[PDB]
Design a protein around this ligand. Structure first.
Ligand SMILES: [Mg+2]
Ligand SMILES: [Mg+2]
Ligand SMILES: [Mg+2]
Ligand SMILES: [Mg+2]
Ligand SMILES: [Mg+2]
Ligand SMILES: [Mg+2]
Ligand SMILES: [Mg+2]
Ligand SMILES: [Mg+2]
Ligand SMILES: [Mg+2]
Ligand SMILES: [Mg+2]
Ligand SMILES: [Mg+2]
Ligand SMILES: [Mg+2]
Ligand SMILES: [Mg+2]
Ligand SMILES: [Mg+2]
Ligand SMILES: [Mg+2]
Ligand SMILES: [Mg+2]
Ligand SMILES: [Mg+2]
Ligand SMILES: [Mg+2]
Ligand SMILES: [Mg+2]
Ligand SMILES: [Zn+2]
Lengths: 37, 138, 204, 159
RNA sequence: UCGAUGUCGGCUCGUCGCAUCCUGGGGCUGAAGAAGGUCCCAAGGGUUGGGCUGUUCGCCCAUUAAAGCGGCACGCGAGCU
RNA sequence: CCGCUGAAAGCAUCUAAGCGGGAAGCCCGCCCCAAGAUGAGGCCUCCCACGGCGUCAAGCCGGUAAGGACCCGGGAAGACC
């Protein structure tokens, strides 16, 4: 998914970085691109 | 009952070089200067006191982040528009007015408040093409 | 920036050998400049222009012969061109060359109290099925108690026309500087005899 | 860094040497020093408003002096069918799949050196603008559109 | 509020919200391309003509890029029907 | 939404210092009104005594000009103005 309210870390490689308040998740596979919005 | 009153004293043409001060924190010095809340002659219905000339506008620094945060909505045009102006735009075009809008809320609301706002002569400084007369109160 | 003063004198379709281009005829006469509004005393870089010079001593206190060919001031009165800067004198039509677009700004034909269904193209009401005294009325002009007022930009009955209007991108199709005409393709606003300023293009 | 000639102002460290001058700002904190080319940059203040600026400027001054000692070569590979990047003047024209083959201008300090129509590199006295105008050239065509089109630095094609 | 707040719908005029139906961006896609799906920004502009019903709403017809969901006293009768 | 540079955390990360792209969206650009913008602007031009009543060119009038009205002929201006 893309924009959740609760953002998990469903991988081991999903970094949980935070770019201007929004708790993103980046990865190497793109399906894990969470946003917390 | 006694008699206390002031008389029409020749004004105080204070300059305020405002290179550093945050607006608001400056402007409540300016409004307290604009009303006669600093001379002990103060009747509240004469608009005595200072004719403040705050100069050296934009680079009025503001607080923590108010880069496109502080919204100057004020102008309801009149059918569909509350038109919004952030402080970046305000300091960009006619800077000149963030101080005017800062003191126009700290002055009172009646006709004495409106007369007192005409005393404040904001410029974008220096060289306010106005003066030879400057008790530059800092 | 390519400005002139002129008179809309009529319309005529002429032919560019293949079609019928329906031009009007602007009498963009030789307009003497009367004051070059400089940007260091005004801020404009504009130029006041003139028109027809036969004003038999109706020239009161704007007598103002401070230009070397002032051509005593027209009651076909002064207007501006806002970003102009000529180079010689009495700018004629040769500034315009056939094939360049112009914006023509003129006072439109006023229609008085041309009330609504004419001013704002309202759909009026039904001419039948029922009552009758609403055939050309605006109908509703708001909502009930909230807002409980008419919005201030409301379209209603008013003084239609007689305000300056600018048609942008009219092709200059020809000039006839044998009699100093200017021919643009389309509908220059105003009466056939009214005043139109003709400016440079705001294409680019 | 032997050939550099670094100088300090309050609002700016300023680096020089065998290529040119770079003018790197900093927060003026700690009244930081210099003894040689690479520096012990200073902080005693353990809070995060300074504990990261130290380290940031430790890498930034190093990137500046390395840019004057040739911090240059970011290599853009072009993959697939011959989307040739060829230099004309200094603004490079690369013909990637378009009706309008793209001419990319440099910012002042950067030149696009073109070895082949298979690869280009972007050189300049920086890392900031160098990565930026490798990035605009990669944004001419973001690569991985069901593979082998687009341009790459050294990235990894997976299906 | 019953010493009255006229009441459904349509017409007319609108204006606003965004929780968008197009249009402009974009992310993923079980995204070859064309499509599309879903989600994020995004009201600036739109948002058709009909048949039936008093109808709002629907069912259709022919389109459309889309034929938005609402609010504004289920907007609007000192404007009308 | 994607970046570049890069720490906090020797790796990376669009971000905390910075800086870039980027939406019909926002501001300005385009068109129109607009100095009643008491903040009442600017520019060009034209006209300029004191004789008269004081704690004085006198705050009040009478003759002044530059001009403006009144009126009349009108008008693709317009209900009147
Ligand atoms: Mg005074
Ligand atoms: Mg003075
Ligand atoms: Mg008329
Ligand atoms: Mg009708
Ligand atoms: Mg009736
Ligand atoms: Mg009847
Ligand atoms: Mg009742
Ligand atoms: Mg009652
Ligand atoms: Mg595919
Ligand atoms: Mg949204
Ligand atoms: Mg809408
Ligand atoms: Mg509605
Ligand atoms: Mg109702
Ligand atoms: Mg009724
Ligand atoms: Mg009613
Ligand atoms: Mg790196
Ligand atoms: Mg940028
Ligand atoms: Mg605007
Ligand atoms: Mg005025
Ligand atoms: Zn993952």
């Amino acid at each position: 998914m893309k924009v959740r309210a609760s953002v998990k870390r469903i991988c081991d490689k999903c970094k949980v970085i935070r770019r201007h308040g929004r708790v993103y998740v980046i990865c190497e596979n793109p399906k894990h691109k969470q946003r917390q919005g | 009952m006694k008699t206390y009153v002031p008389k029409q004293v020749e004004p105080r043409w204070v300059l305020i070089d405002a290179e550093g001060k945050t607006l608001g924190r400056l402007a409540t010095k300016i409004a307290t200067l604009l009303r006669g809340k600093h001379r002990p002659d103060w009747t509240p219905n004469v608009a005595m006191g200072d004719f403040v000339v705050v100069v050296n506008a934009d680079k009025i620094r503001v607080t923590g982040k108010k880069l496109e945060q502080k919204i100057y909505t004020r102008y309801s045009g009149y059918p569909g528009g509350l038109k919004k102006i952030p402080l970046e735009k305000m300091l960009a075009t006619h800077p000149e007015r963030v101080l005017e809008h800062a003191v126009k809320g700290m002055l009172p609301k009646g006709p004495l408040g409106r007369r007192l706002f005409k005393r404040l002569k904001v410029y974008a400084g220096p060289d306010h093409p106005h003066q030879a007369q400057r008790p530059e109160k800092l | 920036m390519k400005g002139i003063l002129g008179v809309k004198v009529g319309m005529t379709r002429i032919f560019r050998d293949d079609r019928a281009v329906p031009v009007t005829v602007i009498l963009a006469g030789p307009c003497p400049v009367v004051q070059r509004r400089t940007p260091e005393k005004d801020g404009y870089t504009a130029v006041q222009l003139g028109f027809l010079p036969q004003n038999p001593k109706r020239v009161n206190r704007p007598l103002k012969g401070h230009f070397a060919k002032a051509g005593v001031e027209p009651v076909r009165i002064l207007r501006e061109i806002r970003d102009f800067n000529p180079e010689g004198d009495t700018v004629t039509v040769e500034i315009f060359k056939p094939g360049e677009r112009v914006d023509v700004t003129g006072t439109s034909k006023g229609r008085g109290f041309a009330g609504v269904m004419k001013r704002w193209n309202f759909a009026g009401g039904p001419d039948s099925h029922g009552a009758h005294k609403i055939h050309r009325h605006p109908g509703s002009i708001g909502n009930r108690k909230t807002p409980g007022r008419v919005y201030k930009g409301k379209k209603m009955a008013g003084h239609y026309g007689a305000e300056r209007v600018t048609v942008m991108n009219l092709e200059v199709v020809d000039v006839i500087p044998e009699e100093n005409l200017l021919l643009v393709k389309g509908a220059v606003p105003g009466p056939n005899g009214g005043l139109v300023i003709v400016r440079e293009t705001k294409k680019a | 860094p032997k050939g550099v000639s670094v100088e300090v102002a309050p609002g700016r460290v300023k680096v020089k040497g065998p290529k040119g001058e770079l003018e790197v700002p900093v927060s003026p904190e700690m009244r930081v020093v210099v003894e040689e080319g690479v520096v012990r940059v200073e902080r005693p203040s353990d809070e995060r408003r300074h504990k990261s600026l130290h380290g940031l400027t430790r890498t930034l001054i190093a990137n500046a002096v390395k840019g004057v000692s040739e911090g240059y070569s970011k290599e853009l590979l072009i993959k697939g069918i011959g989307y040739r990047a060829r230099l004309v003047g200094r603004a490079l024209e690369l013909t990637v799949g378009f009706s309008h083959p793209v001419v990319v201008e440099p910012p002042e300090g950067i030149t696009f050196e073109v070895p082949e129509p298979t690869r280009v590199r972007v050189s300049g006295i920086d890392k900031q603008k160098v990565g930026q105008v490798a990035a605009n050239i990669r944004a001419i065509r973001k690569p991985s559109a069901y593979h082998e089109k687009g341009i790459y630095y050294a990235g990894e094609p997976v299906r």
